[PDB]
Symmetry: D2
Subunit: 21 residues, 4 copies
């Protein structure tokens, strides 16, 4: 799930975890 060079998939997974402490 990439937007050009950005790995949106990865950043979103990190956010989900960060918000579910």
């Amino acid at each position: 799930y990439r937007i050009x060079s950005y790995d949106f998939x990865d950043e979103l997974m990190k956010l989900l975890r960060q918000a579910a402490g």
Copy 2:
């Protein structure tokens, strides 16, 4: 849009901006 005291809405909006840069 928060999960507990985590500002998920905001962080997601920041990801959409970064991904779009």
Copy 3:
């Protein structure tokens, strides 16, 4: 915020609203 002709931004905003109902 689109992936090709898919309006991802919009659909995501709709998910945030539904999840918050």
Copy 4:
């Protein structure tokens, strides 16, 4: 990744796929 009864994780995964046809 739940918001009350809503499975945000699941809906978001479906959206990612839908936008990556």
